[PDB]
Amino acid sequence: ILALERLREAYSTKGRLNQSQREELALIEQAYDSPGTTLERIKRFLLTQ
Amino acid sequence: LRAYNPKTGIESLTATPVSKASAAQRAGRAGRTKPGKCFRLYTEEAYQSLPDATVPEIQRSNLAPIILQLKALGIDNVLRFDYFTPPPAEQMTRALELLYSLGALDDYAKLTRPLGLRMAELAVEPMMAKTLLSAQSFGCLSEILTIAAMTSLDGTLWIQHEGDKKKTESVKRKFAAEEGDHLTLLNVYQAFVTKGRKEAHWCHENMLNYKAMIRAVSIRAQLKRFLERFGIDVEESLSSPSVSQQPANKAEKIQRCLTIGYFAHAAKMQPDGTFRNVSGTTVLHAHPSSIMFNRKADWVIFHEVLETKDKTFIRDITRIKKEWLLEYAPDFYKTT
Amino acid sequence: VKGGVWTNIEDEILKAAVSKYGLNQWARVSSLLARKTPKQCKARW
Amino acid sequence: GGLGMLSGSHILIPASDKRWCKQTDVGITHFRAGMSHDEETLIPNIARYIIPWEAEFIDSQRVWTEYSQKRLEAQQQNRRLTLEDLEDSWDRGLPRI
Amino acid sequence: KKLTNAQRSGLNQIPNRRFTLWWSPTINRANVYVGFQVQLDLTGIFLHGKIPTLKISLIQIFRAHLWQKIHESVVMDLCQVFDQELEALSIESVQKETIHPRKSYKMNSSCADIQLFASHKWNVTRPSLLFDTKDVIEATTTNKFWIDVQLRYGDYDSHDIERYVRAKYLDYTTDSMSLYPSPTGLMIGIDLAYNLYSAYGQYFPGLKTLIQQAMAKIMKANPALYVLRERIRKGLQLYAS
Amino acid sequence: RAAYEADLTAQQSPYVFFGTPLPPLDPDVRDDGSYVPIWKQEARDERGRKRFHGAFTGGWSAGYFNTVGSKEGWTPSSFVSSRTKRWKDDPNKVEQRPEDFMDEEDLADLEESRKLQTREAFSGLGSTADDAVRASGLMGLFRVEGETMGVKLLKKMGWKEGQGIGPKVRRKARLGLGSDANITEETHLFAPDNVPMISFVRKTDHKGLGYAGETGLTPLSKPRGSIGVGILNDTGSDDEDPYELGPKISYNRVIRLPLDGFVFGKEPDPLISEIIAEGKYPPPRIPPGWVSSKKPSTAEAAKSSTLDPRARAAILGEKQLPGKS
RNA sequence: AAAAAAAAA
RNA sequence: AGCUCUCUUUGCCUUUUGGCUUAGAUCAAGUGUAGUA
């Protein structure tokens, strides 16, 4: 939870965001919707990648 | 299952869990010729948890045509009738409000003799029956008679050739007109009948069906016969070469007759490409079969509306104007 | 969709795009490819 | 409709910006407020609305010792501290209470 | 939308236009220390210096000769209300003078608007304001009256309407170049930028109540005034709840 | 243009006899009628130049070329009346409407303000406003339905809110005295209760039966107005509460082997068992001696079907609604 | 105490 | 051991990239359905 809002403090609700910020916002909302898969992906990346 | 929400008053084709009778007939139809297997993809406690029978169908359907039919039989006392199951008390209020908006019923919940019977005895959807019965008092009738023939039709006219995308777009634009999908259907009928010589292979190059649309031809014959027992002479001027009337005003006449008959289903296009109702609450999208799917419009009428699993689609778009709707629905619309 | 795995179509279009535009204009090259960004084209090369 | 700027400078307002007209049915009144003064009212400095740090630290220490006091004689009584006994201690403390 | 840089800059300058319109009486000031006072064409708005955002917003407010149509609307409303009160005022006839079509925005010289021909020689008073009650009737008698209406777009420093109509009546009856049909008339001034009204000059008995009631009625419900207020409200995007 | 659009329109579609056929799909001519999002549109004017023309609509020019006037000029009207001839007793008294002082764009945005709304006595499509009204307590108790007149004509024909539609029910009562069956049971004539509406959950997914699913998280908490900062210079909300930081916080008051992965049903389905079985009831006795009593167009009738529903219900013996009386 | 900056049979 | 024509190889380059700077700057995107006939 905490990590997500830190990233979302970087971007105001409105704005002219380019592609990578909206990809990040999509990833953050996806993490909010599906947290277990996000945490498992984070641990897999942290072990493997 | 098809359901009909009466508060919003829209259809919905939604994926419901099956009934115990449904999974029962599932297992029964599994093992027909040899002892077979069933593969219900859910747990046994879930199997205990489904309802025993299907949802009653009169609680999730348009009660407007069946209240119309029950009045056509003569049982006006629809409240005191021996139904097998009682319908919801407010869905039929929406139904009879729909009946009043089409005329038919009076202020005193009685069928009107001249018009109400004439919408009553037809086997067509009531709103466009009201469209048809208003044509003679205003003008052109055979064109919307043809549209009534082809709207009483379920399977689509255009065959789905997945190998053609710009070609099917061209052969739709071979017939298409900007003033609604109804004029496109009228054009395909007039192309098939006047010069087509009832020929199926011509429909085979034109990506068109054969059986359902000649069934619609028979439907047009039946509607013309039913109006012949209405005592109104049929103005069959299509065979005549009298084209001296200007076609723009006649197309305006056709869509004006439609908006007299389809005043309830009115929507406005929003600049993100969507459609909203008069209240501006429900989100409506153009169905991916009309030409108006990819065209600009301001105010539209649609033959039907249905809620799918994700988006609400509206069908048979036709262009209108605002002051037409203010003129022809004084009891139903009023300016701000 | 702006993601996926690299197909043969995309690799050949990327190489022809690099032949025309060079290795310092990845936004033109990525404009050629529908599903790939300038960073993804650069990473693929 | 103004710009809403906040000021940190000594900006005096001449009294010509203290008059107003009003229309009535028996006449029109052109009021000029501040006639009894020959003194201009001054634009409020922002720094007079911000509590100095030293006093804020002192009150933070004092009101947190008070909070520990009410926690000690609150847990030997009720189970949760209310929002009436801490209304006096509301916007105090560097970790605000 | 896919939008050009001139249009980007126009959209970016819109709130500055609204701010400049809102604070226009204190920006378009008279105490200025320098600035060539020019008049905006076909209006009575005087500009000191060049402020382009103020000028473009004021042109948008007063499009399509709206100053002239306001003047015509107010004078014809006054003329018809005059037409309802001939009998008690001993007015023999009422006339609407329409010699100069574009006099509503000329501030150097003015002409009469409405003429009232009297059946009997009225005893005019000393020239007094509309809200002045100490009427001093003089023994000089006359048989003709005229009503002049003028529109003022006042500013923050000069929007006293009584002194304005006093100065205007004395200046337009002192000089010989301005032609008035009778020596006794009534000057009516309408401060358009603050919604004020005043009248100054002679009065035959019974006129004062009619003028004040009619003026209140038409400041409440003139149509051209209404479209002026609607244009200002749309320009500010300032609404009432 | 001209000849090309005409003859390729004639070539692509002679079959559109009614209406107007679509403009040709060519690289030369443009398809004006097709939709072109909002992030693809160009802002053009009536003429068709990328240019704005207002003080508050983003233009560097307002009025008739930075002038309050017009091309045609303006001419005042004459107005003469007296005792012999007055204006108010005139036959054609032209009143002063506030629309001859308006411009074409004033009329345009005035009719833009004139929104269309459905009437209060008839329900429109998707009118979703009663949910917040009903869930208000005493406000929902005092405020009632807005008397859509289908409901009141149903009241006229003998229906009451709180119960449904059907034949009369000869049930005694529930007095609220428990479940006492010692009442005399003289069974007044009542009406059937309303069946509840079905409110089906939205199924946008292929999730299986009985699956609650992976639970989703929530974000961690969360003289009126200003002039504005422009719609392009807003970027994102760089105009907050100017006085104090942060969004305001909500405050608490106090502190055979089956298939792999497939389980076997312990008990069979009852009706896949009674399909073999004989059922719960025997066939009738059928004694000897009984014998069969009898030994071994629609369109044209519909043409002559002149029976009105009044005489139809008279000969079918169905009670009718009361009319005007 | 104007210009950029509001298009070539 | 010549002169013409043909072919190959060698030469030739013959339509053979005409400045600058913060690579001059920036660059997400309409809708795609379809228990039953």
Which helix or strand (DSSP H or E) is residue A36 part of? helix A35-48
- Name every chain D residue with its beta carbon within 8 A of the beta carbon of F254: 80-83
Tokens of B302: 């649609």
Residues 167-226 of F with CB under 8 A from E: 224
What's the CA gap between F78 and E76, in Å, rounded?
9
CA F257-F262-F268 angle, 5° bins: 80
Q: Angle F104-113/E223-236 helices, nearest 10 degrees?
A: 70
Rounded CA–C1' distance between C24 and H18, in angstroms: 22
For B105, B271, E19, E76, F101, the CA distances from E64, given in Å and listed in that order, are 53, 31, 23, 19, 8
Does D contact B via 3+ CB–CB distances below 8 Å? no
Which residue from F217, F236, F237 is facing A35, i.e. has the nearest CB?
A: F217
Tokens of B294: 């990819």
What's the CA gap between F90 and E80, in Å, rounded?
13
- Name every chain C residue with its beta carbon within 8 A of the beta carbon of A23: 2
- With contact defined as beta carbons under 8 Å apart, do B175 and B207 qualify? no
Report the candidate in E123, E127, E114, E125 with the shortest Cα–Cα distance to residue E85.
E114
What's the CA gap between E105 and E39, in Å, rounded?
9
What end-to-end distance do the CA atoms of chain A give, in Å? 23
Classified as helix, coil or strand, B219 is: helix
Any idea which nucleotide's C1' is nearest the CA of B156? H34
Report the candidate in B119, B111, B126, B21 with the shortest Cα–Cα distance to residue B64.
B126
Count, residues in chain A = 49
What's the CA gap between B314 and B303, in Å, rounded?
7
Report the candidate in E62, F114, D88 with the shortest Cα–Cα distance to residue B334.
F114
Report the candidate in F66, F88, F70, F71 with the shortest Cα–Cα distance to residue F79.
F88
Tell me, rounded to whole angstroms, the distance of Cα E85 from its chain centroid: 23
Classified as helix, coil or strand, E171 is: helix
How many Å lie between the alpha carbon of F239 and the closest alpha carbon of chain A? 11
The one-letter amino acid at C41: C
Report the candidate in B282, B335, B319 with the shortest Cα–Cα distance to residue B12.
B282
- Name every chain F residue with its beta carbon within 8 A of the beta carbon of D4: 226, 242
Interface check F209 vs B, CB under 8 A: yes
Which residue from D1, D23, D25 is facing E196, i.e. has the nearest CB?
A: D23
Which helix or strand (DSSP H or E) is residue E11 part of? helix E5-22
Please enumerate in sequence order all residues whose Cβ is within 8 A of that of B123, keeping only pairs 6 or more positions apart, or say none: B152
Report the candidate in A2, D94, B261, B105 with the shortest Cα–Cα distance to residue F150.
B105
DSSP state of B134: T
H runs (alpha helix) in B229-319: 247-261
What's the CA gap between F124 and B333, in Å, rounded?
10
Can you tell me which residue has the tokens 């395909």?
B188
Which residue from F226, F242, F254 is facing D83, i.e. has the nearest CB?
A: F254
- With contact defined as beta carbons under 8 Å apart, do A34 and F205 qualify? no
DSSP state of D9: S
What's the CA gap between B66 and F147, in Å, rounded?
24
What's the CA gap between B183 and B178, in Å, rounded?
8
Classified as helix, coil or strand, E198 is: strand
Beta-strand relationship, E185-191 and E137-152: parallel
Report the candidate in D23, F101, D41, F65 with the shortest Cα–Cα distance to residue E154.
D23
Contact across the interface for D80 and F255, Cβ inside 8 Å: yes
What's the CA gap between E63 and E65, in Å, rounded?
6
CA C20-C22-C23 angle, 5° bins: 150
Does F contact A via 3+ CB–CB distances below 8 Å? yes
- With contact defined as beta carbons under 8 Å apart, do B102 and B127 qualify? yes
Residues 10-49 of A with CB under 8 A from C: 19, 23
**Residues pairing with E145 in the sheet:** E116
Classified as helix, coil or strand, E60 is: helix
Please enumerate in sequence order all residues whose Cβ is within 8 A of that of B270, keeping only pairs 6 or more positions apart, or say none: B276
Does E contact B via 3+ CB–CB distances below 8 Å? no
- With contact defined as beta carbons under 8 Å apart, do F132 and B312 qualify? no
Tokens of E55: 């000028």
For B25, B35, B40, F72, F274, the CA distances from B47, given in Å and listed in that order, are 14, 22, 9, 82, 18
- Name every chain F residue with its beta carbon within 8 A of the beta carbon of D83: 251, 253-254
Interface test with C, best of A19, A22, A25, A30 (most C CBs within 10 A): A19
- With contact defined as beta carbons under 8 Å apart, do E100 and E128 qualify? no
- With contact defined as beta carbons under 8 Å apart, do E15 and F230 qualify? yes
- With contact defined as beta carbons under 8 Å apart, do C41 and C14 qualify? yes
Burial class (CB in 10 A: 0-12, 13-18, 19+), F312: middle
For B4, F260, F262, F267, the CA distances from F257, given in Å and listed in that order, are 46, 9, 10, 17
What's the CA gap between F278 and F111, in Å, rounded?
75
Report the candidate in E39, E31, E36 with the shortest Cα–Cα distance to residue E49.
E36
- With contact defined as beta carbons under 8 Å apart, do E64 and F70 qualify? yes
Please enumerate in sequence order all residues whose Cβ is within 8 A of that of D50, keeping only pairs 6 or more positions apart, or say none: none
Tell me, rounded to whole angstroms, the distance of Cα B227 from its chain centroid: 20
Residues 1-45 of C with CB under 8 A from A: 2, 37
- With contact defined as beta carbons under 8 Å apart, do E149 and E119 qualify? no
Which residue from A5, A13, A36 is facing F214, i.e. has the nearest CB?
A: A36
Classified as helix, coil or strand, F31 is: coil
Count, residues in chain E = 241
Q: How many CB atoms lie within 10 A of CB B36?
A: 11
Q: How many CB atoms lie within 10 A of CB B37?
A: 10
Strands of the sheet containing E196-201, edge to edge, are E91-96, E114-125, E137-152, E185-191, E196-201, E128-129
Contact across the interface for F232 and E8, Cβ inside 8 Å: yes
DSSP letter string over B37-73? -----S-HHHHHHS-SSPPPGGGSS--HHHHHHHHHH
Sign of the Cα torsion F180, F181, F184, F186 reads: positive
- With contact defined as beta carbons under 8 Å apart, do E61 and E21 qualify? yes
Please enumerate in sequence order all residues whose Cβ is within 8 A of that of F217, keeping only pairs 6 or more positions apart, or say none: A1, A32, A33, A35
Q: Which residue of F has its CA nearest to B174?
A: F13
How many Å lie between the alpha carbon of A25 and the closest alpha carbon of chain C? 14
Classified as helix, coil or strand, F167 is: coil
Beta-strand relationship, B333-335 and E128-129: unpaired
- Which contacts (CB < 8 Å, 24+ apart) does range F230-237 have? F230/E11, F230/E12, F230/E14, F230/E15, F231/E11, F232/E8, F232/E11, F232/E12, F233/E12, F234/A14, F235/A12, F235/A14, F235/A15, F235/A16, F236/A11, F236/A12, F236/A13, F236/A14, F236/A15, F237/A12, F237/A13, F237/A14
H runs (alpha helix) in chain B: 20-30, 44-49, 64-73, 91-101, 116-120, 126-133, 142-151, 166-173, 181-194, 200-205, 211-228, 247-261, 322-328
Q: Which residue of F has its CA nearest to E59?
A: F68
What's the CA gap between B147 and B141, in Å, rounded?
10
Can you tell me which residue has the tokens 């097998």?
B84
H runs (alpha helix) in E23-144: 24-27, 52-61, 66-83
Beta-strand relationship, E91-96 and E114-125: antiparallel
What's the CA gap between E214 and E231, in Å, rounded?
24
Report the candidate in E25, E22, E23, E24 with the shortest Cα–Cα distance to residue E155.
E25
How many Å lie between the alpha carbon of F226 and the closest alpha carbon of chain D? 6
What's the CA gap between F56 and B275, in Å, rounded?
29
What's the CA gap between E51 and F178, in Å, rounded?
86
The one-letter amino acid at F171: R
Interface test with D, best of E26, E31, E131 (most D CBs within 10 A): E131
Give nucleotides in strand H with any atom < 7 A to a protein C-beta.
23, 26-37
Please enumerate in sequence order all residues whose Cβ is within 8 A of that of B118, keeping only pairs 6 or more positions apart, or say none: B129, B133, B230
Q: To the nearest 10°, the Cα dihedral for B270, B272, B276, B279?
A: -70
Give nucleotides in strand G with any atom < 7 A to a protein C-beta.
1-2, 5-7
Contact across the interface for E101 and F76, Cβ inside 8 Å: yes
DSSP letter string over C1-45? -------HHHHHHHHHHHHHH-SS-HHHHHHH-SS--HHHHHHH-
Rounded CA–C1' distance between D72 and H4, in angstroms: 126
Tokens of F250: 């909500």
Which residue from B8, B111, B177 is facing F21, i.e. has the nearest CB?
A: B177
CA E182-E186-E192 angle, 5° bins: 140
Report the candidate in E83, E71, E59 with the shortest Cα–Cα distance to residue E149.
E71
DSSP letter string over F86-151? -STT-SS-----TTSS--HHHHHHHHHHS-EEE-TTS--TT---HHHHHTTTHHHHHS-----HHH
Interface check F246 vs A, CB under 8 A: no
Tell me, rounded to whole angstroms, the distance of Cα B264 from its chain centroid: 13
Contact across the interface for D30 and E160, Cβ inside 8 Å: yes
Any idea which nucleotide's C1' is nearest the CA of E35? G1
Q: To the nearest 10°, the Cα dihedral for E107, E109, E113, E116?
A: 140
Rounded CA–C1' distance between F207 and H5, in angstroms: 86
Rounded CA–C1' distance between C25 and H20, in angstroms: 19
Please enumerate in sequence order all residues whose Cβ is within 8 A of that of E232, keeping only pairs 6 or more positions apart, or say none: E21, E61
Tokens of B103: 């005329």
Any idea which nucleotide's C1' is nearest the CA of C42? H23
What end-to-end distance do the CA atoms of chain E give, in Å? 31
- With contact defined as beta carbons under 8 Å apart, do D38 and D71 qualify? no
Q: How many CB atoms lie within 10 A of CB F161?
A: 13
Classified as helix, coil or strand, E185 is: strand
Q: How many CB atoms lie within 10 A of CB F250?
A: 7
Does F contact E via 3+ CB–CB distances below 8 Å? yes
**Residues pairing with B275 in the sheet:** B269, B284
Instruction: Count H helices and E strands in chain D, helices first.
Output: 1, 2
Tokens of B291: 């030409």
Residues 17-36 of F with CB under 8 A from B: 17-22, 25, 33-35
